[PDB]
Design a protein around this ligand. Structure first.
Ligand code: DGD
Ligand code: DGD
Ligand code: CLA
Ligand code: CLA
Ligand code: CLA
Ligand code: PL9
Ligand code: PL9
Ligand code: SQD
Ligand code: LHG
Ligand code: LHG
Ligand code: OEX
Ligand code: CA
Ligand code: CA
Ligand code: CL
Ligand code: CL
Ligand code: CL
Lengths: 153, 112, 334, 137, 37, 49, 243, 34, 30, 97, 38, 97, 34
């Protein structure tokens, strides 16, 4: 849009926030729209546009190199979204691109594994305690602990 | 209170246009007008930036036959749109909404 | 005994009406804080800018909600995954505008509910029980973690955590369908098998035990009086129950071992719900439901729609309409 | 309905000449379009600039005209803006920029023709879906 | 817990039920006009 | 049976299929706002309960 | 010299540069030379809202408010021509920059007042014969205040100006007249006024700083209600350059 | 007629609350041992 | 009035929890 | 009497042609040779009292002038509408596919 | 801001210390059966 | 742990019948209403407020926007006997998407 | 908010009527001979 003549610093979006650029809650200049959440992102293709106060408007207006445009276009169109059968893109996208990001494969697999390992931890920690104390096979009918305890009421 | 009469919609070329009626399934329904063969000729757009069928572009008018508006024609887009919105419900009526503080939302009959 | 020794004895006492324990030492204050904040916010909180676009959403009863529409609204998209405790705000008025109560509540809740799980292990140990009730509770707990923490992490914002409210829950579900096609995801399908099956087996077990209660009462009294708390003898005839159910289907499809049956009753819903939780927790990283959009094509190349394509049209409606003022660019990437 | 020789007959140049692609060329074109182009051009739209699509009518009004094999093959070597005014190889995949767009390195002249033929044949099959976006899904 | 010896049973006989219901109903018939105003 | 019988035709009953049933769920959301219905909510509580 | 990593999350990014107490010099204006402001920064420190008159129709006062949208308020990286006029006055013609911020402030009792705090299209002039910019120079001018929401903005019932429904579709048979103000979105465009009071000048670098006070209308919710009058006070910084 | 909109609930609870108190007391008297 | 009603029902439920727990009929082994 | 100004504008030439004073820049893709080079110059140098004034933009080539002349029949001008030109909307009006 | 923060920090530290020292206080022995697990 | 517990096995098992069985029966009643489009679609008080007040928003109003999208986007292909033709311009959409 | 003006009495009686039924039954059970 800047190539088309938009002044991206002064462009007010539908909500009143900058369409392209806005402030983080501590004032740094950041990209606008939903990506406001991602302003902590740092990457080699973006950093040259960063000044002391965040994204620098003069650098944006004058210093964006073709390699940055290419990289941003590449990354935008290889976002880590895709279906289980490896159809790349948003959930409503048509079949055409065979893509699921390695980042998604690696994050999901390791969440599943970590989760079941927490379960295994609880299973085995609870069992180790019970076995050590001698009641992992059940309650001794003639020595049921609760039967020697006072009633709750 | 009374039937307003039958609304006949026409575009700038004078072709009769027909409002697509709301099926019972739909709580809300768009306003789309077609010619006698079902070709879209006018609508009320949501996004305006690429609108091609707006009542303003197509010069849509409405004329009434029978009922209280018999013999009358309206050409101003706000009024023509208003009647098109009612035409999705079928025949158009005047209502007293004051007496019962009616809220504008459909209720079923003893049949339902 | 010194004071510390006495305190430890009381904390871990098997005689307290409600067990405290060491997990309970964390659980009690955290759950109380979460509960108190939730109740006050649900009644009295002002509107919250959930999507960081200065478009505050009213969640509280006093600000025009009923029980069904009301919620504690997620914290602002401007915050993202930033930690927003009360002391990070310049005022309570700011804290409220930005959805601070949501973070206070869900963080205290998740901590408290994790301790609730530990506390279940803890008491089972004090009573000389086997230890795995807490493993069954890990299923709903994991599900709560998925919607309040893991999904926000993956998407980069607590503004995408499930709202604390009835209609907000439905909002979360519909948007989730648009963005992940969860219905077409096998882990959610296993979840459905888990809960439909859990309900089926619950009704089944209920009905079979009830069907074979041993006559101990007359017709003018509840059959429930036929069982006395702590009696040694079983109160129904499992042989008659198995005799019935084995003939309903066939002999070998019925359990004659109560331990096996009750294990199945535990395992079916728990495993299914673990998969449900993992569905949410992996769609959190955008590995989404099966996508068969335009999978069937004729000899010329015409798309022949299937039910998958009709689902797709519904999903598109959700997608284009959700957070109608929040997107400036053509793709919804988180 | 079938993928006939007529469906597979597309304009070779602006001077009225056509070429009839084989079924194998059509398959190759789909494959290569998916391989090199679909990341941005899935279904005939353009993700990084939705104002410009791959519709035949759109390609016809491009400068130089792009609604024929030669126009498209030339685009893939030396892409321009829609008015022909600037050369955009530095930001758009092309043979000239195969150094910075490495997927273009193994594309042969034959491959470009297959991709070009895909772009022209697909709307003949898919109608408004091609370049239509989600509205037509 | 050891039982409280101060406990007493409570009674309302039928006549008292009838008298009480009459009081309440007649009071309601009297005051209702004022509540509606 | 009862649902399609109250509607225009059997067309609007659920079709016997996995994806078809999912379509039926989403139809009920968009057209009936079925999540908002306290009878469905009691169903949910009984299933999850 | 501070980097992004030094500044990030401190609040400093929402602050304008300051000049130390020794900066009480004079910056010469050569009336044959052309000039620009290379960077204008405005950091609001107080937002005041004019209370709506009870009906006494005395002087309604501007009252204090609490900022609820955090450190997101400053205007910065603004640039424009600094013309030297024939009578020796200087006129700043704002060209571009981060020249607006949506801001929500809250009045006692809870009423939230959103506004588009802005200097869009600022044209500000000094007194005549300003042969040097000194701590006695002031700039006064006006700016444009467009609608706080732009034309695509959709209300919670899907209604908008350039997009959206044009009616209350949830009340299919309600009488339209009573709902016209909510149904028909209008786009506001009004004027604001600002004074810039120079308190510090570095003659050598061309840097000036001072205090400002601006007055403008708040958000009118696309014509659904009356806007409030807002007075914004704060500090400013500008770098003057030959260009 | 423009009546007080709380008159209905006021009247209903005015009757129900004490009537219910009396019925509770009566029935539990009857159920005591003869 | 609606808000009062909702909060009133909620408050009754919380009171009910208290009685159901601390003032339950105690379970007794016969 | 309240008016939606965009709907109203659709009943003027704005609804029939590319309005050099108001129309979003993607509309210039409709005709050969206008986008992006001339489109940018046109939007940047708006508003115009008449369609022919577009020929007076500084720096134009003879080729560009001729393309403009061939396309005047597709252009109009109407009063600038604040709702259409604020927000940088002439460059990006929130519409993609 | 600051007093609240310090107060919560102290409160949290207090309860965490109870949790840690509590489980360190011969927890394996606090069961109805075999206590000699050292 | 929880404050209450079963003490009667017969009650426990009856309750296990009661709960899912009663749930399913309740859902069936709602569907009988839906046969007639007798929905819980709206809260009238919500709609009256939102119609008059364009700043009033709840998760309830948000979900109806989603519903309106579902209906418009799915109906033409889902209900082919209606022969729906909804021009691009009438389709409800938020910004960008 | 423009709520249904019968919602208050509807809700109050919905709670009171069955709750009162249960309290009556409970109390007369308690008062029966031990
Ligand atoms: C014994 C245990 C003791 C536990 C006691 C409780 C103590 C509290 C623990 C904190 C709980 C975690 C909450 C926050 C998790 C989170 O937001 O985690 C995310 C962080 C990473 O944070 C991100 O880190 C990023 C770092 O990248 C930065 O730097 C990069 C460098 O290349 C890049 O440049 C990048 O672009 C740039 O942004 C940024 O700072 C982001 O803004 C920031 O969000 O992960 C991390 O710190 C580490 C990962 C945390 C673990 C994940 C939690 C899962 C646990 C749930 C288990 C389920 C339980 C089931 C029960 C049944
Ligand atoms: C009691 C009853 C309980 C019932 C509930 C049970 C829940 C599970 C039910 C799931 C059943 C799966 C049906 C199989 C569907 C299928 O045929 O799936 C087919 C897919 C492949 O689909 C193809 O995927 C393709 C992908 O296209 C992409 O890639 C293509 C090239 O590959 C092209 O390039 C194309 O352009 C591009 O879009 C296209 O979409 C094709 O049309 C499409 O057919 O298989 C794949 O994805 C392969 C990899 C994924 C398989 C994973 C299976 C799920 C396992 C979960 C169970 C957990 C068990 C744990 C054990 C402990
Ligand atoms: C960390 C583990 C891990 C990860 C992240 C990946 C990632 C990937 N693999 Mg690799 N691989 C793995 C392990 C892994 N693999 C193992 C164990 C094998 C031996 C079978 C392989 C052999 C292999 C081959 C031959 C290929 C891949 C390919 C791929 C890619 C596509 C995957 C796909 O389409 O999935 C499809 C999804 C599934 C099949 C679903 C898996 C669901 C499982 C069953 C659920 C697990 C749940 C849990 C663990 C069970 C607990 C039960 C509970 C009750 C306790 C992707 C980058 C493909 C590729 O692109 O290569 C270039 C390919 O051709 N992988
Ligand atoms: C069991 C007691 C308990 C616990 C665990 C918490 C926990 C929490 N409170 Mg809550 N709170 C409590 C009681 C508690 N609260 C009470 C009684 C009140 C009323 C006064 C409050 C009022 C309150 C408010 C108003 C707020 C919180 C907030 C928070 C969060 C941040 C706390 C923090 O920054 O500490 C920092 C402390 C540490 C990092 C401790 C380090 C020192 C130890 C000794 C080192 C070891 C710890 C290490 C991390 C590993 C854990 C050990 C493990 C392996 C066993 C967190 C969810 C904030 C919030 O919710 O934000 C969204 C918030 O605004 N609390
Ligand atoms: C929290 C998530 C959740 C939960 C727990 C439920 C729970 C429920 N939903 Mg709801 N749903 C939800 C979310 C949820 N829903 C959402 C977000 C929506 C969007 C609006 C819906 C939309 C929806 C619709 C449209 C419907 C439900 C229905 C139901 C009920 C289904 C009961 C059932 O088992 O039918 C399963 C079917 C039966 C019990 C019929 C008998 C089946 C026989 C015995 C099968 C015999 C099989 C045989 C042996 C052969 C098998 C062969 C094999 C090859 C397959 C249940 C109360 C249904 C309901 O209300 O019905 C009254 C229904 O129609 N839901
Ligand atoms: C007109 C004409 C031609 C008439 C001819 C009729 C005629 C005479 C026919 C005879 C010939 C003939 C038999 C033909 C057969 C035709 C045929 C194949 C029909 C197909 C029928 C059909 C669709 C069958 C589907 C199969 C079916 C019913 C499957 C479901 C069953 C199934 C999967 C069960 C396993 C599920 C499972 C693990 C259950 C255990 C969990 C559970 C219930 C726990 C509760 C529980 C269990 C206990 O166990 C006990 C103890 C107690 C306490 C308890 O809590
Ligand atoms: C400030 C304000 C107002 C805040 C409130 C805001 C807010 C959102 C409130 C929520 C509102 C709310 C409650 C909404 C839900 C409403 C709703 C849908 C209600 C459903 C009503 C209904 C009649 C549904 C019909 C279906 C039905 C009957 C469902 C009942 C479900 C139910 C209660 C299931 C049981 C759940 C449960 C936790 C049981 C515990 C049982 C238990 C102690 C087991 C332990 C145990 C196990 C053993 O095996 C043995 C051996 C022993 C000994 C033993 O003990
Ligand atoms: C072709 C594929 C290639 C192969 C690849 C292999 C894949 C791995 C398969 C996994 C193996 C599973 C082992 C099960 C053993 C076991 O459970 O033993 C425990 C008992 C032992 O059985 C009991 O056994 C007892 C004897 S003993 O304990 O075994 O000694 C006996 O007394 C009793 O009557 C009898 O019921 O099993 C049972 O109680 C009955 C079976 C219950 C089913 C358990 C599965 C859990 C639920 C399903 C998960 C839900 C999924 C759906 C989502 C909703
Ligand atoms: C805010 C929360 C408020 C909740 C509080 C609940 C309020 C409960 C109110 C209880 C009132 C019940 C009255 C008990 C009524 C009752 O039990 O009467 C009979 C009762 C007889 O008592 P005895 O000593 O004989 O004992 C019998 C025992 O069984 C009684 O428990 O005497 C009285 O209670 C004295 C009051 C006389 C009342 C006489 C008036 C009736 C005459 C008819 C008047 C109407 C007609 C007039 C026509 C003009
Ligand atoms: C860490 C401490 C946590 C404490 C949290 C408080 C937990 C409260 C538990 C419920 C107490 C109320 C029980 C009354 C009823 C009561 O006293 O039950 C007691 C009853 C005892 O059963 P018995 O077997 O002893 O009785 C059988 C014989 O009496 C036959 O008549 O328990 C059950 O029936 C279990 C099934 C009901 C389970 C109901 C759980 C409902 C959860 C709450 C849902 C409502 C949410 C509303 C939110 C607004
Ligand atoms: O925030 Mn709640 O939902 Ca997850 O996607 Mn992007 O962001 Mn928003 O749009 Mn779709
Ligand atoms: Ca009225
Ligand atoms: Ca001064
Ligand atoms: Cl939404
Ligand atoms: Cl965005
Ligand atoms: Cl187009």
């Amino acid at each position: 849009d800047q190539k088309l003549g938009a002044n991206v610093g002064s462009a007010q979006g539908p909500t009143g926030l900058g369409k392209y650029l806005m402030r983080s809650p501590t004032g740094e200049i950041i990209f606008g729209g939903e990506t406001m959440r991602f302003w902590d992102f740092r990457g080699p293709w973006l950093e040259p546009l960063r000044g002391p106060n965040g994204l620098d408007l003069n650098k944006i207006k004058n210093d964006i190199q073709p390699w940055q445009e290419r990289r941003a276009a590449e990354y935008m169109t290889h976002a880590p979204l895709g279906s289980l059968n490896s159809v790349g893109g948003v959930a409503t996208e048509i079949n055409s691109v065979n893509f699921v990001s390695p980042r998604s494969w690696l994050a999901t697999s390791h969440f599943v594994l970590a989760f079941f390992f927490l379960v295994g931890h609880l299973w085995h920690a609870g069992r180790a305690r019970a076995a050590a104390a001698g009641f992992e096979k059940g309650i001794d009918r003639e020595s049921e602990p609760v039967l020697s305890m006072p009633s709750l009421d | 209170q009374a039937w307003k009469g039958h609304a006949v919609f026409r575009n700038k070329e004078g072709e009769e246009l027909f409002v697509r009626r709301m099926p019972a399934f739909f709580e809300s329904f768009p306003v789309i007008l077609t010619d006698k063969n079902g070709v879209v000729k006018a609508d009320i757009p949501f996004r305006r930036a690429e609108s091609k069928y707006s009542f303003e572009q197509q010069g849509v008018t409405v004329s009434f036959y029978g009922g209280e508006l018999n013999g009358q024609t309206f050409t101003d887009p706000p009024t023509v749109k208003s009647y098109a919105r009612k035409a999705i419900f079928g025949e158009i009526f005047e209502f007293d909404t004051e007496t019962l503080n009616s809220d504008g939302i459909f209720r079923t009959s003893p049949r339902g | 005994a010194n004071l510390w020794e006495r305190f430890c004895n009381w904390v871990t006492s098997t005689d307290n009406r409600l067990y405290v324990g060491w997990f309970g030492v964390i659980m009690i204050p955290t759950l109380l804080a979460a509960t108190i904040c939730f109740v006050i916010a649900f009644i009295a909180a002002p509107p919250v800018d959930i999507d960081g676009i200065r478009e505050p959403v009213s969640g509280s009863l006093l600000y025009g909600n009923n029980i069904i529409t009301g919620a504690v609204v997620p914290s602002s998209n401007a915050i993202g995954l930033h930690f927003y405790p009360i002391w990070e705000a310049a005022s309570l008025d700011e804290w409220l505008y930005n959805g601070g109560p949501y973070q206070l509540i869900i963080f205290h809740f998740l901590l408290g509910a994790s301790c609730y799980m530990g506390r279940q292990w803890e008491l089972s140990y004090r009573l000389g029980m086997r230890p795995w009730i807490c493993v069954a509770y890990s299923a709903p707990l994991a599900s709560a973690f998925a919607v309040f923490l893991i999904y926000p992490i993956g998407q980069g914002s607590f503004s995408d955590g499930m709202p604390l409210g009835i209609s907000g829950t439905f909002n979360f579900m519909i948007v989730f369908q648009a963005e992940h096609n969860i219905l077409m995801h096998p882990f959610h399908q296993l979840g459905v098998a888990g809960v439909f099956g859990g309900a089926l087996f619950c009704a089944m077990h209920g009905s079979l035990v009830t069907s074979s209660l041993i006559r101990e009462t007359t017709e003018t009294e509840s059959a429930n009086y036929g069982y006395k708390f702590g009696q040694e003898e079983e109160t129904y005839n499992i042989v008659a129950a198995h005799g019935y159910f084995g003939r309903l289907i066939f002999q070998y499809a019925s359990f004659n071992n109560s331990r096996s049956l009750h294990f199945f009753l535990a395992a079916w819903p728990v495993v299914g719900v673990w998969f449900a939780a993992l569905g949410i927790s992996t769609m959190a990283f955008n590995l989404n439901g099966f996508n068969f959009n335009h999978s069937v094509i004729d000899a010329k190349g015409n798309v022949i729609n299937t039910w998958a394509d009709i689902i797709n049209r519904a999903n598109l409606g959700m997608e284009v309409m959700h957070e109608r003022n929040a997107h400036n660019f053509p793709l919804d990437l988180a | 309905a079938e993928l006939t020789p007529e469906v597979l007959t597309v304009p070779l140049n602006s001077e009225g000449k056509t070429i009839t692609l084989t079924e194998k060329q059509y398959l190759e074109g789909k494959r290569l379009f998916q391989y090199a182009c679909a990341s941005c051009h899935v279904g005939g739209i353009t993700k990084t600039n939705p104002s410009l699509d791959l519709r035949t009518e759109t390609l016809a009004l491009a400068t130089p005209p792009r609604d024929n094999i030669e126009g498209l093959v030339d685009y893939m070597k030396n892409p321009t803006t829609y008015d022909g005014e600037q050369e955009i190889a530095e930001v758009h995949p092309s043979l000239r920029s195969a150094d910075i767009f490495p997927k273009m390195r193994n594309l042969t002249e034959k491959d470009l023709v297959a991709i070009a033929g895909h772009i022209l044949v697909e709307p003949k099959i898919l109608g408004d879906k091609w370049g239509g976006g989600k509205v037509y899904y | 817990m050891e039982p409280n010896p101060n406990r007493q049973p409570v009674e309302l006989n039928r006549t008292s039920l009838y008298l009480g219901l009459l009081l309440i109903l007649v009071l309601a018939l009297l005051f209702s006009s004022y509540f509606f105003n | 049976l009862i649902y399609p019988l109250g509607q225009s035709s059997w067309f609007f009953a659920p079709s016997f299929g996995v994806a078809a049933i999912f379509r039926f769920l989403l139809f009920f959301q968009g057209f009936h706002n079925w999540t908002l219905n306290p009878f469905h909510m009691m169903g949910v509580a009984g299933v999850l309960g | 010299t501070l980097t992004y990593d030094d500044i990030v999350g401190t609040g400093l990014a929402n602050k304008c540069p300051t000049l130390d107490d020794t900066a009480r010099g004079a910056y010469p204006i050569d009336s044959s030379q052309t000039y620009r402001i290379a960077r204008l920064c405005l950091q609001p420190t107080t937002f005041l809202v004019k209370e709506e008159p009870k009906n006494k129709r005395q002087e309604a006062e501007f009252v204090p408010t609490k900022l609820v949208t955090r450190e997101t308020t400053s205007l910065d990286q603004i640039q424009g021509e600094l013309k030297v006029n024939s009578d020796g006055s200087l006129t700043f013609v704002e060209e571009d920059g981060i020249d607006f911020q949506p801001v929500t402030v809250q009045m006692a009792g809870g009423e939230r007042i959103p506004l588009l705090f802005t200097v869009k299209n600022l044209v500000a002039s000094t007194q005549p014969n300003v042969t040097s910019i000194t701590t006695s120079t002031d700039f006064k001018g006006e700016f444009n205040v467009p609608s706080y929401r732009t034309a695509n903005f959709l209300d919670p019932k899907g209604r908008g100006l350039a997009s959206g429904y044009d009616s209350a579709i949830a009340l299919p048979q309600a009488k339209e007249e009573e709902l016209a103000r909510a149904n028909v979105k209008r786009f506001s465009l009004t004027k604001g006024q600002i004074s810039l009071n120079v308190a510090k000048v570095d003659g050598r670098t061309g840097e000036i700083a001072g205090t400002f006070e601006s007055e403008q209308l708040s958000d009118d919710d696309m014509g659904a209600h009356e806007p409030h009058e807002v007075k914004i006070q704060g500090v400013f910084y500008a770098s003057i350059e030959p260009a | 007629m423009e009546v007080n909109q709380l008159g209905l609930i006021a009247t209903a609870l005015f009757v129900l609350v004490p009537s219910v108190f009396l019925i509770i007391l009566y029935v539990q008297t009857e159920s005591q041992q003869k | 009035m609606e808000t009062i009603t909702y909060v009133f029902i909620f408050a009754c439920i919380i009171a009910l929890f208290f009685f159901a727990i601390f003032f339950r009929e105690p379970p007794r082994i016969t | 009497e309240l008016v939606n100004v965009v709907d109203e504008k659709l009943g003027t030439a704005y609804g029939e042609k590319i309005d050099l004073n108001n129309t979003n820049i993607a509309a210039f893709i409709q005709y050969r040779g206008l986008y992006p080079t001339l489109a940018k110059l046109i939007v940047k140098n708006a508003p115009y009292e008449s369609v022919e004034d577009v020929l007076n933009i500084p720096g134009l080539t003879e080729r560009q002038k001729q393309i403009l002349r061939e396309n005047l029949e597709h252009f109009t001008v109407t009063e600038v509408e604040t709702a259409l030109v604020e927000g940088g909307d002439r460059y990006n009006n929130g519409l993609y596919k | 801001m600051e007093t609240l923060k310090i107060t919560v920090y102290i409160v949290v530290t207090f309860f965490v210390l109870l949790f840690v020292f509590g489980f360190l206080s011969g927890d394996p022995a606090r069961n109805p059966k075999r206590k000699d697990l050292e | 742990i929880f404050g209450i517990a079963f003490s009667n096995k017969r009650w426990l098992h009856f309750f296990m019948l009661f709960v899912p069985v009663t749930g399913l029966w309740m859902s069936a009643i709602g569907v009988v209403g839906l046969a007639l489009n007798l929905r819980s679609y709206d809260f009238i008080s919500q709609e009256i407020r939102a119609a008059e007040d364009p700043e009033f928003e709840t998760f309830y109003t948000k979900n109806l926007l989603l519903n309106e999208g579902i209906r418009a986007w799915m109906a033409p292909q889902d209900q082919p006997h209606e022969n729906f033709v909804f021009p691009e311009e009438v389709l409800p959409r938020g910004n960008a998407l």
